[PDB]
Amino acid sequence: GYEVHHQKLVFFAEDVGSNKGAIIGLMVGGVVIA
Amino acid sequence: GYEVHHQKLVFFAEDVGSNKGAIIGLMVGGVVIA
Amino acid sequence: GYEVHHQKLVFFAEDVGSNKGAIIGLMVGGVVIA
Amino acid sequence: GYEVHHQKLVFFAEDVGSNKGAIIGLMVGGVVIA
Amino acid sequence: GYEVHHQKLVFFAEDVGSNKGAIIGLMVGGVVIA
Amino acid sequence: GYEVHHQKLVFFAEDVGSNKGAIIGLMVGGVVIA
Amino acid sequence: GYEVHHQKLVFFAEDVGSNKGAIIGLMVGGVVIA
Amino acid sequence: GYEVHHQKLVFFAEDVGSNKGAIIGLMVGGVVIA
Amino acid sequence: GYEVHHQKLVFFAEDVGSNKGAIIGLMVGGVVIA
Amino acid sequence: GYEVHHQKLVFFAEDVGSNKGAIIGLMVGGVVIA
Amino acid sequence: GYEVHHQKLVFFAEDVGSNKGAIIGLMVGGVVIA
Amino acid sequence: GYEVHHQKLVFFAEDVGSNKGAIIGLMVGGVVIA
Amino acid sequence: GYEVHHQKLVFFAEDVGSNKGAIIGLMVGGVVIA
Amino acid sequence: GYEVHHQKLVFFAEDVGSNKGAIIGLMVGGVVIA
Amino acid sequence: GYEVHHQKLVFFAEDVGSNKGAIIGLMVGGVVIA
Amino acid sequence: GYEVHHQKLVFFAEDVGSNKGAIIGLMVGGVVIA
Amino acid sequence: GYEVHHQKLVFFAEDVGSNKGAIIGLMVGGVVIA
Amino acid sequence: GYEVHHQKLVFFAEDVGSNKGAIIGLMVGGVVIA
Amino acid sequence: GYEVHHQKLVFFAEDVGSNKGAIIGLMVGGVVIA
Amino acid sequence: GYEVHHQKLVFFAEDVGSNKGAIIGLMVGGVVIA
Incomplete structure (x- = not known):
């Protein structure tokens, strides 16, 4: 009995x-400018 | 019995x-400008 | 009995x-400017 | 009986x-300017 | 009986x-300027 | 100049x-028996 | 100049x-038996 | 100049x-038997 | 000049x-039997 | 000049x-039996 | 002689x-939200 | 002789x-939120 | 002779x-939030 | 002779x-929050 | 001869x-919070 | 609530x-004789 | 609540x-004779 | 509550x-004779 | 509460x-004769 | 509570x-004769 x-x-x-x-949710790599 | x-x-x-x-949800890599 | x-x-x-x-949620690496 | x-x-x-x-939530490495 | x-x-x-x-939540390393 | x-x-x-x-790579849910 | x-x-x-x-790589939930 | x-x-x-x-890599929850 | x-x-x-x-790498919760 | x-x-x-x-690497909570 | x-x-x-x-170049009055 | x-x-x-x-260049009055 | x-x-x-x-360049009055 | x-x-x-x-360049009066 | x-x-x-x-360059009066 | x-x-x-x-209200330039 | x-x-x-x-209200430049 | x-x-x-x-209210420059 | x-x-x-x-209210420069 | x-x-x-x-209210520079 598993619930x-x-x-x-x-x-x-x-x-x-x-x-x-x-x-950005996820990034491996790069350049982000804001 | 598994539920x-x-x-x-x-x-x-x-x-x-x-x-x-x-x-951007997910990126492996690049340049993002905003 | 497991619940x-x-x-x-x-x-x-x-x-x-x-x-x-x-x-940014997660990044392995890069440059972020804000 | 495990709950x-x-x-x-x-x-x-x-x-x-x-x-x-x-x-930034998590970063392995990089440069952050704000 | 474990709860x-x-x-x-x-x-x-x-x-x-x-x-x-x-x-920044967590960083392994880098440069942070604010 | 971005690379x-x-x-x-x-x-x-x-x-x-x-x-x-x-x-299984990713599972939202279910019963797995091996 | 960004690299x-x-x-x-x-x-x-x-x-x-x-x-x-x-x-299993990732599981949100369930029952796993090996 | 950023690298x-x-x-x-x-x-x-x-x-x-x-x-x-x-x-299991990551589990939010469940029952695991080995 | 940042590296x-x-x-x-x-x-x-x-x-x-x-x-x-x-x-198990990470578990939020559950029952683990080995 | 930062390195x-x-x-x-x-x-x-x-x-x-x-x-x-x-x-188990990390556990928020539960019952572990070995 | 005028120049x-x-x-x-x-x-x-x-x-x-x-x-x-x-x-806005010029305003006499109001509410501005940005 | 005027120049x-x-x-x-x-x-x-x-x-x-x-x-x-x-x-805003000029305002006589109001509420500004940014 | 005027120059x-x-x-x-x-x-x-x-x-x-x-x-x-x-x-804001000039204001006679109001509320500014930034 | 005027120059x-x-x-x-x-x-x-x-x-x-x-x-x-x-x-703000000039203000006669008000509330500023930053 | 005036120069x-x-x-x-x-x-x-x-x-x-x-x-x-x-x-703020100039103010006659008010409340400033920073 | 803004008024x-x-x-x-x-x-x-x-x-x-x-x-x-x-x-003259406003003049960018010229010769004015009264 | 802003008024x-x-x-x-x-x-x-x-x-x-x-x-x-x-x-003359405002003059950028010129010759004015009264 | 701001007024x-x-x-x-x-x-x-x-x-x-x-x-x-x-x-003259404001003058950037010129010759004024009265 | 700000007034x-x-x-x-x-x-x-x-x-x-x-x-x-x-x-003259304000003058950046010139020759004024009265 | 600020007033x-x-x-x-x-x-x-x-x-x-x-x-x-x-x-003259304000003068940056010039020749003034009365």
């Missing part, structure tokens, strides 16, 4: 507001 | 607001 | 406000 | 306010 | 206010 | 050996 | 040997 | 040997 | 030997 | 030997 | 760059 | 850079 | 850089 | 750098 | 650097 | 009396 | 009496 | 009497 | 009497 | 009497 329930994973966000700049 | 329920994975967002700039 | 429930993982945020600058 | 419930892990934040500068 | 409940881990913050400067 | 090069991302593996059991 | 190079990210492995049991 | 190079991130392993039991 | 190089991050291991039991 | 180099971070191990029992 | 030449009046600007926010 | 030449008046600017916020 | 030349008046600026906040 | 030349008046600035906060 | 030349008046500045706080 | 009211701007006058001579 | 009211700006006058001579 | 009220700015005058001569 | 009120600024005058000669 | 009130600034005068000669 597993209500598990959640969020990497970056659930709610992201307005953006004028730069939003 | 598994209500699991969720979100990588970047559920709700993303207005965008004037740059939004 | 597992209500577990949550958040890496960066649940709620992210307005952005004029640079927001 | 495990209500566990949470937050790496960076739950609520992130407005951003004009640079916010 | 485990209400455990929480926060690495950086739960609530992060407005940012003009540089906020 | 970005040789970035790589691997999620599960580059080289997976032989399999008699069960290998 | 970014040779960054790498590995989540589970680069090289996974043989498997008779169960290997 | 960033040779950064690496490994979450679970680079090299995983043989498996008769259960290996 | 950043050779930074590394390892969470669980670089080299994981053979497994008859249970290995 | 930063050769920084390293290890959380659980670099080299993990064989396992008959239970190894 | 008048090369006179210039600029109220706001000669060159205005890119705009994501609010630019 | 008048090369006179200039600038009220706000000659060159205005990029704008994410609020730029 | 008048090369006179300049600048009220706020000649060159204004990038703006994320609030820039 | 008048090379006169300059600057009230606030000639060169204004980047702005995240609040810059 | 007048090379006169300059600066009220606040010639060069103003980056601003995160509040810069 | 802005009763702001006024007058450049030259509200009430100009009789004129036998020369009245 | 801004009764601000006024006058450049040259509110009430200008009779004129036999020369009245 | 700003009754601010006033006058540059040259509120009330200007009769004129036989020359009245 | 700002009754601030006033006068540059040249509030009340200017009759003029037979020359009155 | 600021009844501040005043006068540069040249509030009340200027009749003028047969030359009155």
Whole structure:
């Protein structure tokens, strides 16, 4: 008798507001200018 | 008797607001200007 | 008799406000200017 | 009889306010200017 | 009879206010100017 | 003058050996028996 | 003048040997038997 | 003049040997039997 | 003039030997039997 | 003129030997039996 | 013998760059949100 | 014999850079949020 | 014999850089938040 | 014989750098928050 | 024979650097928070 | 909740009396004889 | 809750009496004879 | 809770009497004879 | 709770009497004869 | 709880009497004859 329930994973966000700049969830590499 | 329920994975967002700039979920690499 | 429930993982945020600058969840490497 | 419930892990934040500068959850390395 | 409940881990913050400067959760290394 | 090069991302593996059991890269949820 | 190079990210492995049991990279939730 | 190079991130392993039991990189929750 | 190089991050291991039991990198919660 | 180099971070191990029992890098909570 | 030449009046600007926010030359009154 | 030449008046600017916020040359009154 | 030349008046600026906040040349009154 | 030349008046600035906060040339009155 | 030349008046500045706080040239009165 | 009211701007006058001579509100340049 | 009211700006006058001579509000340059 | 009220700015005058001569509010440059 | 009120600024005058000669509020430069 | 009130600034005068000669509020430079 195994019951597993209500598990959640969020990497970056659930709610992201307005953006004028730069939003990146994940990057291996590079140059970001904002 | 195995019951598994209500699991969720979100990588970047559920709700993303207005965008004037740059939004990237995932990048391996590059140049981002905003 | 095993019951597992209500577990949550958040890496960066649940709620992210307005952005004029640079927001990065995870980076291996690079240059960020804001 | 094993019951495990209500566990949470937050790496960076739950609520992130407005951003004009640079916010990085995790970085292996680089240069950040804000 | 094992019951485990209400455990929480926060690495950086739960609530992060407005940012003009540089906020980094974790870094292995680099240069940060704010 | 921006140059970005040789970035790589691997999620599960580059080289997976032989399999008699069960290998899953990513699972949101379920029951796995090997 | 920006140059970014040779960054790498590995989540589970680069090289996974043989498997008779169960290997899961990422799981939000469930029951795993090996 | 910015140069960033040779950064690496490994979450679970680079090299995983043989498996008769259960290996999980990341789990939000559940029941694991080996 | 900024130069950043050779930074590394390892969470669980670089080299994981053979497994008859249970290995978990990160767990928010649950029941683990080996 | 800034130069930063050769920084390293290890959380659980670099080299993990064989396992008959239970190894967990990080746990928020639960029941572990070996 | 009267000679008048090369006179210039600029109220706001000669060159205005890119705009994501609010630019107003002159206002008697009101509410401005950017 | 009257000669008048090369006179200039600038009220706000000659060159205005990029704008994410609020730029107002002149205001009699109000509320400005940026 | 009257000669008048090369006179300049600048009220706020000649060159204004990038703006994320609030820039006001002149105000009689109000509330400014940045 | 009257010659008048090379006169300059600057009230606030000639060169204004980047702005995240609040810059006001002149105000009769009010509330400024930055 | 009257010659007048090379006169300059600066009220606040010639060069103003980056601003995160509040810069006011002149104010008759009010409340300033930075 | 924002309310802005009763702001006024007058450049030259509200009430100009009789004129036998020369009245000019704004002039970039020229010769004026009265 | 913001309320801004009764601000006024006058450049040259509110009430200008009779004129036999020369009245100029603003001049960038020239020759004025009364 | 912000309230700003009754601010006033006058540059040259509120009330200007009769004129036989020359009245100039602001001049960048020139020759004025009365 | 901020309240700002009754601030006033006068540059040249509030009340200017009759003029037979020359009155100048502000001059960057020139020749003035009365 | 901030309250600021009844501040005043006068540069040249509030009340200027009749003028047969030359009155200048501010001069950067020149020749003045009365």
